Design a protein around this ligand. Structure first.
Ligand SMILES: CSc1ccccc1CC(=O)N1C[C@@H]2C[C@]2(C(N)=O)C1
Ligand SMILES: [Zn+2]
Length: 140
């Protein structure tokens, strides 16, 4: 579990969204595993606007932050899970690092701010849904 809180927005994995998230929906995209809902309080996270390929992510299954090198956002084939059939997920970045299903939501960040959130993984790999192209998160 985990979310990004920026402005009056809450960014979560779409497969972990609550009824309150759907009842206060701003935007959702199944192909990216992302959902954004509105909030009453203002958040403290800042979104990175950069081309970094190195950062640090939070791994709840180890209670630790790990430094990682990650690929550029791309269209990657993801295996069937209890949440989606086997399909291509877009805007996904991969890295070598520990991950388990419940690690989804952990933040990946660089010197500029939040880059994305854990969305996929397995066998020593971890995949992050990028949010750096969602410029509208910084306003309204
Ligand atoms: C950190 S996710 C993970 C890690 C190890 C093993 C298995 C998983 C779970 C997984 O394969 N998922 C979670 C989410 C539904 C997914 C997607 N974004 O298409 C794919
Ligand atoms: Zn950066």
């Amino acid at each position: 579990s985990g979310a990004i809180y920026v402005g009056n927005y809450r960014v979560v994995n779409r497969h972990l969204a609550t009824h309150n998230d759907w009842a206060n929906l701003v935007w959702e995209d199944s192909s990216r595993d992302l959902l954004v809902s509105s909030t009453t309080a203002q958040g403290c996270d800042t979104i990175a606007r950069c081309d970094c390929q190195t950062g640090v992510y939070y791994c709840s299954s180890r209670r630790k932050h790990y430094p990682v090198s990650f690929s550029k956002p791309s269209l990657i084939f993801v295996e069937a899970s209890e949440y989606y059939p086997a399909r291509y997920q877009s805007h996904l970045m991969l890295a070598v690092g520990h991950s388990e299903p419940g690690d989804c939501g952990g933040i990946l960040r660089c010197q500029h701010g939040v880059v994305g959130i854990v969305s996929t993984g397995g066998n020593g790999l971890v995949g992050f849904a990028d949010v750096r192209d969602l410029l509208w998160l910084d306003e309204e």
